[PDB]
Design an enzyme around this catalytic site. Structure first.
Site, mmCIF file in Angstrom:
data_model
loop_
_atom_site.group_PDB
_atom_site.id
_atom_site.type_symbol
_atom_site.label_atom_id
_atom_site.label_comp_id
_atom_site.label_asym_id
_atom_site.label_seq_id
_atom_site.Cartn_x
_atom_site.Cartn_y
_atom_site.Cartn_z
ATOM 1 N N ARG A 1 0.829 -1.200 0.000
ATOM 2 C CA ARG A 1 0.000 0.000 0.000
ATOM 3 C C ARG A 1 0.862 1.249 0.000
ATOM 4 N NH1 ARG A 1 -3.485 -4.354 0.165
ATOM 5 N NH2 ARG A 1 -5.585 -3.737 0.831
HETATM 6 N N1 LIG Z 1 -6.109 3.917 -9.436
HETATM 7 C C1 LIG Z 1 -5.057 3.062 -8.926
HETATM 8 N N2 LIG Z 1 -4.009 3.192 -9.714
HETATM 9 C C2 LIG Z 1 -2.889 2.499 -9.459
HETATM 10 N N3 LIG Z 1 -2.836 1.670 -8.399
HETATM 11 C C3 LIG Z 1 -3.906 1.535 -7.592
HETATM 12 C C4 LIG Z 1 -5.004 2.214 -7.843
HETATM 13 N N4 LIG Z 1 -5.912 1.899 -6.895
HETATM 14 C C5 LIG Z 1 -5.352 1.018 -6.065
HETATM 15 N N5 LIG Z 1 -4.105 0.777 -6.481
HETATM 16 C C6 LIG Z 1 -3.687 -0.093 -5.575
HETATM 17 O O1 LIG Z 1 -4.774 -0.920 -4.917
HETATM 18 C C7 LIG Z 1 -4.439 -1.020 -3.659
HETATM 19 C C8 LIG Z 1 -5.492 -0.444 -2.770
HETATM 20 O O2 LIG Z 1 -6.627 -1.227 -2.783
HETATM 21 P P1 LIG Z 1 -7.822 -0.706 -1.782
HETATM 22 O O3 LIG Z 1 -8.566 0.432 -2.415
HETATM 23 O O4 LIG Z 1 -7.198 -0.236 -0.498
HETATM 24 O O5 LIG Z 1 -8.838 -1.947 -1.469
HETATM 25 P P2 LIG Z 1 -9.201 -2.379 0.065
HETATM 26 O O6 LIG Z 1 -9.955 -1.265 0.740
HETATM 27 O O7 LIG Z 1 -10.044 -3.638 0.053
HETATM 28 O O8 LIG Z 1 -7.915 -2.642 0.813
HETATM 29 C C9 LIG Z 1 -3.021 -0.160 -3.439
HETATM 30 O O9 LIG Z 1 -1.864 -1.059 -3.541
HETATM 31 C C10 LIG Z 1 -2.986 0.668 -4.351
HETATM 32 O O10 LIG Z 1 -1.546 1.006 -4.675
#
Ligand SMILES: Nc1ncnc2c1ncn2[C@@H]1O[C@H](COP(=O)(O)OP(=O)(O)O)[C@@H](O)[C@H]1O
Ligand SMILES: Nc1ncnc2c1ncn2[C@@H]1O[C@H](COP(=O)(O)OP(=O)(O)OP(=O)(O)O)[C@@H](O)[C@H]1O
Ligand SMILES: Nc1ncnc2c1ncn2[C@@H]1O[C@H](COP(=O)(O)OP(=O)(O)O)[C@@H](O)[C@H]1O
Ligand SMILES: [Mg+2]
Ligand SMILES: [Mg+2]
Ligand SMILES: [Mg+2]
Lengths: 188, 79, 512, 54, 470, 347
Positions: free
Chosen positions: C371
């Protein structure tokens, strides 16, 4: 005493004993029922047929009622008679002994007299024992008690008092262990 | 065994007291336990299976389990 | 301080030793079996409070019932008998914390099993405490260098985050943690406190022989002086395996709250869940799916949510967690793996197929993610990592076509070759952590396309030879990349010039 | 001290201190001889080491 | 005066013994003598004046016989502008450290849903700035919105972008209730709203309230904090006919917490370990999240799909309550496309030619057919290759790849990951861009230019620029 | 003195009511008035002076109220060179019809595992002669070895080959413990040992001991015979100090046995019917099978994989304890490859 038993428990015997304690203590009497329940306990262990009768489950409700009457219809507080009738109706008669015991326990908790046990390695000289009584008195100073002695410990020169549910350790063995541990942690 | 929901302390206490007053056990019931929209009722004999019952507040219930010592009712509203 | 003055202080300290004893309510054991003791009385006892039996073993009061109390024996329950005495200590479970812990091996409760000597410490912290709020925390912006090229570049780990090492048996899960601990050693030797990272290793349900070999390895590399090992082995009672992770986390909170940085490595948490399931089932609690208690997710979450990056107002300390999860047949769809993935930030997936195909560390880059992203990496890193990621994706896509199509285009052939060299470069031996700056040089040589010249079988040895050459001849360049943490244009040109030159000079297989 | 050779006063002193603790709600070893006994040996050793910086 | 007292403590479930006048169900009980305020929510009457309750805080430190006080009302939380710009707990405690919360009154978190006669449904397009959503699954102002996603597909990032794009420049207030999610994300969102000036320390401003029942909290807290956030919104709606934006971070955690204690409460487990009352517990919450005659509530809730199994009872039951649905697919992430919005699975009740323009409906259906036809071809493409396909099929494949890449849009909140600045796309431009792609407007340019672009004109310019560069 | 009386009999689980002085857990009790002496190891204190126990021999023929004697000590088996060349029972009785065993002392089968301070690496390879094993997953003398396999893939045959290749030429003592295996194999191995000269009736020879709790035995027996064999080996390791070879024909049975009795003991079942205490019981047995400073124990344990499901709790939990693993695949047998060792799963 507020028509409230010492403790509340959900077990079968606990539930019935608490209701009996409350109901009995409600009208006027607890000591009368205590003799009745105490009599049942002694009988449950002394009379073989009575024990076999209680545990017997193939017996009909009417048959149980008649045999109980033959035992005695009087000398038992009305609460005790009503309790037996209820047990017969609810097939709970087998648990009658436990209830009895449990009830007396509560009663013995209401008893102010308590037994105190002292554990010491060295034999307690009569003169020393009198001093111990003076100390226990000065500690409580408001409740009479009966003292008991016991000497088979590994500790030395130490006294440990058990009072019903409280434990107080004045043993020298504890002092020895505490010092050897704290000296280790000096962190010089 | 473990216990019976019909062996409530209040109901048992009345038997020990020796007063045979059930406040018209038939056609009237007293709630013993309430949880998750299900109420167990001691008494209320002469109640048909699948019949509607009225609670003190006004909400209705359906008698679905006619047991020996109680009646399991499902409340038709907020518990 | 004079020896005599020190001795006088020690004597005075021994003088001021207090010891008070108070009336402690005691109860009797109604029953005892499978390590669970049903106790009568013992009222006014707190939930989770510790109790002591006659022999001297402790117990934890978990179930408070109207009739009795359900206690779990923290040890072997052979001496326990019906009617025995149970004395309430009056304090929730706690463990000794401090710096003297470092270089020792403890059990769940904190007792040292090294045999060196008693623990000289004065601080005891509660094992279960509420996790830090939203305000105390802070954004994660500091790198936690594991020493693994693939991880430090593709799956960066920042101090204060939670990364999950998930995989099957014998895929190299424990190897990654050990390599991380070794990399930290250089910082401790050199007086740079801002990068020191105390490593905590919690071993849950492992044969003592394995932990002993691991401690010997740590001593061999002298990395044990800053490591703490908590052991809850298979022979230990289930409650110990249940409390060890929480005990270790509290030890880490010490460093966290004191402006320091700590890395806690929970060995398989699946084993902790099994112990909790056992301890709960024996307590007659209703079981859930796969017989696990309903609140197993709460167990792991309450543990892992402790790890955080405190704000500068409280010292800027941090606790970084690397929980390990073992999967049966690579099914991450199981119950416990699913929960933990949802809890942590990112996960490092280890694959058995990759392991035996020569890809060791067997890391599946396609699934692994972090993340924090590039927020943790250094400046010199992020630049190269982006292009590296883009290159890896293309190589995976073209692997299938080459095998069956059997025809390769000039452009595709170059991309196919380039990806292969990188995969060989990401390979790494065991117990061989690499410095971050050296990683930059090697990954630089790869993405820029220089490695495409020499044969794949020689890429790994070129790494070693070239790194030594840089350390000897070009040491100022490494110092810049290290101190500044950025790859300047001058360094880019200097490095871009010596790489091809070295490939041509040294004896390698130049034909691509 | 756990051995013989002037251990009688220790048990006697413990009995006196134990009766005190029983007489009271709690127990404190204000009069135990172990701590002074240990201090005597340690003070002798300390006095022995405290000679001069040289 | 405390009438009750603790009698049994197991996990988070607590039984209390009362002497007289038992509290109604759902009432809040206060335990006395705790270092921290501990509240118990009545769940069952066991008889004999006993009640079984769920604790909102950790039960460690409790003791049998500890007195318990009956408040006589369910958990009441402060409502009003005093909550604006302040982080609050499930029971109303301020965890921001800025002081006590000023409230005109306290409202209970439990209430009956609005009647059928006062439903007052209405359909009005909500421009989120996301072209895929605005095109395939339009959002309705005043209607529920669901983001179904597995672990790490980007639903958290999507919530942040909706806030940045919708929360700001929104006349009404906004609420964010995060239940079950991690605490690190909470700190980031608070600081982001402060930077974005959505919230501020200066009073009379900060048009947004925050509620957090994150993981660290025990069960019962994660199960009732969602109701707390919803209660704040209901006040803002009823007492003031102001449009409200309710952002619920994962709601799956709500049902999960309930099941964690269902067993100890006595219920029998259901099919997949969930409580028998899953549907009703969830429906009681959803029905309250609705637009009515007084005001409107636009709720965006994220549903975590464990193991990417959309058949799980929790999300399966939630589907029925939602007006707009956005299903995130993990396969797209592997392809690099973000957001990973499954164009086919995502549906919207507003995707009707009467509600939205007929041209909009026509364009959306064309895209769906194009993508579905491409997915069907993939199988034979694996064995035979793109060459052996006919020109018609080749054109379908080419245009579909370009459309699928064009669906990707870079948001501001995602810069740190990608490094490209976010972009906002209007509705007219979005429809025209996709309409042009269908006609073959971009079949000339490379598919690479249709990646992380906002509008078609921007994409075409980038393609032409790359040519002059080479 | 016979202070106890049988309260209730349920299969292999027996409850006993005592007047006073309840025995400690794991202590051994002897039932009176039954041919083929029956021993019961205490397992739980149920309260009210009742203790629930497991039976080592068939309980058919027991009568409620029957007396029980408290030995006051756990099951104690004879150890020493006298066990060499002799077949023993789970409770130390000789079943070879050779006469009473001469043992210096009797060790209890229940003991705590060696501490962390007493552990040895001893990373020296053990050449078995099998190219696949020596190549892919070489065995280490002084370390734990585990053979995983389904029904009829070559586990028993592989054990015999190791004995022929390793045990015979071995210098130190050896111990073979069979847990829930076919009695025919025990007879064949005993006679094959006598023939190979590894064991003989002549005193001072027979550098190998035998223990058997074969299938015919009831639960509680298959659950403790492993501990009995393990104890015979611990003596040689600690007192004699010499190297030891511990062979264990399938150990899964041990686990299985405990499961078959767990339900009767009142425990709530685990995932697929196993007992909740699977890992802890298995670990208590496994932590004792280890090399120390006193001596080395090279242990070869055969693990039965039920229905070829390696994800079963028993073999899964066992994997963690083993240093070397040899997983046998049934697909290879169909192809005709023997030994059917999966090179990719044998670590
Ligand atoms: N628009 C995006 N562009 C590039 N990478 C993304 C994008 N959205 C998420 N990532 C990746 O997805 C992951 C986040 O997922 P997330 O929204 O937190 O789902 P959850 O809430 O179930 O954990 C991160 O590693 C983030 O870097
Ligand atoms: N980078 C590496 N290079 C070469 N070999 C490696 C590497 N990493 C691990 N190995 C090998 O993997 C084996 C051990 O893997 P490891 O124990 O670290 O993973 P694990 O998941 O903890 O296994 P287990 O489930 O048994 O604990 C060893 O045989 C080791 O030699
Ligand atoms: N080396 C081998 N060569 C040829 N056949 C073999 C070999 N090993 C086993 N077989 C076959 O495997 C079968 C079963 O072997 P065994 O070890 O007894 O299986 P199990 O694990 O069920 O006890 C033998 O009947 C034999 O036919
Ligand atoms: Mg490992
Ligand atoms: Mg999220
Ligand atoms: Mg076999």
């Amino acid at each position: 005493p507020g028509d409230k038993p010492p403790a509340i428990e959900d077990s079968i015997h606990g539930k019935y004993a608490g209701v009996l304690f409350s109901s009995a203590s409600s009208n006027k009497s607890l000591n009368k029922v205590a003799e009745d329940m105490k009599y049942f306990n002694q009988l449950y262990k002394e009379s073989e047929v009575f024990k076999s009768f209680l545990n017997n489950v193939s017996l009909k409700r009417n048959q149980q009622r008649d045999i109980i009457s033959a035992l005695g219809k009087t000398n038992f507080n009305p609460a005790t008679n009503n309790l037996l009738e209820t047990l017969i109706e609810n097939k709970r008669l087998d648990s009658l002994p436990k209830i009895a015991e449990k009830y007396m326990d509560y009663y013995r908790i209401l008893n102010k007299q308590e037994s105190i046990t002292i554990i010491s390695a060295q034999e307690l000289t009569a003169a020393e024992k009198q001093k111990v009584e003076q100390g226990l008195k000065k500690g409580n100073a408001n409740v009479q008690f009966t003292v008991v002695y016991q000497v088979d410990p590994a500790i030395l020169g130490g006294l440990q008092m058990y009072s019903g549910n409280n434990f107080l350790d004045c043993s020298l063995l504890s002092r020895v262990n505490k010092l050897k541990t704290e000296i280790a942690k000096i962190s010089f | 065994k473990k216990l019976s929901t019909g062996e409530a302390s209040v109901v048992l206490a009345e038997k020990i007291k020796g007063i045979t007053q059930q406040n018209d056990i038939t056609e009237y019931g007293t709630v013993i336990s309430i949880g998750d929209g299900i109420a167990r009722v001691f008494g209320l004999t002469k109640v048909q299976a699948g019949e509607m019952v009225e609670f003190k507040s006004g909400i209705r219930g359906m008698a679905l389990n006619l047991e020996t010592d109680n009646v399991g009712v499902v409340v038709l509203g907020n518990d | 301080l004079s020896t005599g003055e020190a001795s006088v202080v020690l004597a005075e300290k021994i003088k001021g030793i207090t010891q008070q004893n108070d009336i402690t309510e005691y109860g009797t054991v109604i029953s005892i079996g499978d390590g669970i003791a049903r106790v009568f009385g013992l009222t006014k006892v707190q939930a989770g409070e510790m109790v002591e039996f006659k022999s001297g073993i402790r117990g934890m009061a978990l179930n408070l019932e109207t009739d009795n109390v359900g206690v779990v024996v923290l040890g072997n329950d052979r001496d326990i008998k019906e009617g025995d005495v149970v004395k309430r200590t009056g304090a929730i479970v706690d463990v000794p914390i401090g710096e003297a812990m470092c270089g020792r091996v403890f059990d769940a409760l904190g007792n040292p099993i090294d045999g060196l000597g008693p623990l000289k410490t004065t601080q005891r912290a509660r094992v279960e405490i509420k996790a830090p709020g939203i305000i105390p925390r802070q954004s994660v912006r500091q790198p936690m260098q594991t020493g693994i090229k693939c991880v430090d570049s593709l799956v960066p780990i920042g101090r204060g985050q939670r990364e999950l090492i998930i995989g099957d048996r014998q895929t190299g899960k424990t190897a990654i943690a050990i390599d991380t601990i070794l990399n930290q050693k250089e910082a401790f030797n050199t007086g740079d406190v801002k990068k020191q990272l105390y490593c905590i290793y919690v071993a849950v349900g492992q044969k003592r022989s394995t932990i002993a070999n691991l401690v010997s390895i740590l001593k061999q590399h002298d990395c044990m002086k800053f490591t703490i090992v908590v052991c809850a082995t298979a022979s230990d009672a289930a409650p110990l395996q249940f409390l060890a992770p929480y005990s270790g986390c509290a030890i880490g909170e010490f460093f966290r709250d004191n402006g320091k940085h700590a890395l806690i490595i929970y060995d398989d948490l699946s084993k902790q869940a099994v112990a909790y399931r056992q301890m709960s089932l024996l307590l007659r609690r209703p079981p859930g799916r796969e017989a696990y208690p309903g609140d197993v997710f709460y167990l792991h979450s309450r543990l892992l949510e402790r790890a955080a990056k405190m704000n500068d107002s409280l010292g800027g300390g941090s606790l970084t967690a690397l929980p390990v999860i073992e999967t049966q047949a690579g099914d991450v769809s199981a119950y416990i793996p699913t929960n933990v993935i949802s809890i942590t930030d990112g996960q490092i997936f280890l694959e058995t197929e990759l392991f035996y195909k020569g890809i060791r560390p067997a890391i599946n880059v396609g699934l692994s993610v972090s993340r924090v992203g590039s927020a943790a990496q250094i400046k010199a890193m992020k630049k190269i990592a982006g292009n590296l990621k883009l290159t890896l994706a293309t190589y995976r896509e073209l692997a299938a076509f080459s095998q069956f199509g059997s025809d390769l285009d000039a452009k595709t052939q170059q991309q196919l070759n380039t990806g292969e060299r990188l995969v060989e470069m990401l390979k790494q031996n065991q117990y061989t952590p690499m410095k971050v700056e050296e990683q930059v040089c090697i990954i630089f040589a790869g993405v820029k396309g220089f490695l495409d010249a020499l044969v794949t079988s020689e890429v790994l040895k070129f790494e070693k030879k070239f790194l030594e050459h840089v350390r000897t001849n070009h040491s100022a360049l490494l110092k810049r990349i290290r101190d500044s943490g950025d790859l300047s244009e001058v360094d880019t040109n200097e490095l871009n010039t010596i790489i091809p030159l070295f490939i041509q000079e040294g004896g390698f297989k130049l034909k691509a | 001290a756990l051995k013989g050779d002037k251990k009688a006063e220790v048990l006697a002193r413990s009995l006196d201190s134990a009766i005190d603790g029983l007489s009271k709600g709690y127990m404190d070893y204000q009069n135990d001889p172990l701590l002074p006994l240990i201090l005597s040996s340690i003070e002798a050793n300390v006095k022995k080491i405290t000679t001069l910086s040289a | 005066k405390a009438n009750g007292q603790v009698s049994q403590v197991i996990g988070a479930v607590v039984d209390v013994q009362f002497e007289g006048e038992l509290p109604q169900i759902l009432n809040a009980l206060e335990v006395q003598g705790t270092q921290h305020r501990l509240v118990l929510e009545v769940a069952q009457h066991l008889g004999d004046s006993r009640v079984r309750t769920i604790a909102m805080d950790s039960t460690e430190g409790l003791v049998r016989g500890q007195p318990v006080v009956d408040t006589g009302l369910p958990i009441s939380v402060p409502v009003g502008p005093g909550t604006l710009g302040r982080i609050m707990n499930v029971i109303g405690e301020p965890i921001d450290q800025r002081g006590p919360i000023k409230a005109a009154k306290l409202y209970p978190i439990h209430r009956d849903a609005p009647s059928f006669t006062d439903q007052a449904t209405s359909a009005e397009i909500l421009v989120t700035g996301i072209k895929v959503v605005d095109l395939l699954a339009p959002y309705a102002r005043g209607g529920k919105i669901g983001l179904f996603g597995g672990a790490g597909v980007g639903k958290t990032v999507l919530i942040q972008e909706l806030i940045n794009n919708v929360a700001k420049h929104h006349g009404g207030y906004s609420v964010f209730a995060g239940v079950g999610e991690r605490t690190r994300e909470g700190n980031d969102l608070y600081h982001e709203m402060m930077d974005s000036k959505v919230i501020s320390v200066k009073e009379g401003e900060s048009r947004c309230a925050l509620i957090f029942g994150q993981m660290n909290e025990p069960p019962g807290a994660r199960a009732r904090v969602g109701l707390t956030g919803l209660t704040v919104a209901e006040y803002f709606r009823d007492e003031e006919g102001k449009d409200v934006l309710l952002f619920v971070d994962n709601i799956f955690r709500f049902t999960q917490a309930c099941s964690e204690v269902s067993a100890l409460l006595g219920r029998i487990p259901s099919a997949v370990g969930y409580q028998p009352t899953l549907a009703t517990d969830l429906g009681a919450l959803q029905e309250r999240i609705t637009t009515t005659q007084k005001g409107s509530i636009t709720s965006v809730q994220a549903i975590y799909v464990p193991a990417d199994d959309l058949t799980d009872p929790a999300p399966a039951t939630t589907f029925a309550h939602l007006d707009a649905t956005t299903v995130l697919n993990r396969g797209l992430t592997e392809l690099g496309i973000y957001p990973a919005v499954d164009p086919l699975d995502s549906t919207s009740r507003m995707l009707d030619p009467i509600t939205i323009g007929e041209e909009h409906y026509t364009v959306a259906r064309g895209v769906q057919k194009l993508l579905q036809d491409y997915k069907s071809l993939q199988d034979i493409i694996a064995i035979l290759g793109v060459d052996d396909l006919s020109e018609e099929d080749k054109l379908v494949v080419a245009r579909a790849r370009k459309v699928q890449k064009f669906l990707s849009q870079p948001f501001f909140m995602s810069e740190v990951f990608s490094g490209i600045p976010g972009r906002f796309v209007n509705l007219k431009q979005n429809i025209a861009s996709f309409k042009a792609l269908l006609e073959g407007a971009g079949d000339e340019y490379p598919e690479s230019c249709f990646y992380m672009k906002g509008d078609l004109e921007e994409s075409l310019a980038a393609g032409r620029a790359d040519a002059l560069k080479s």
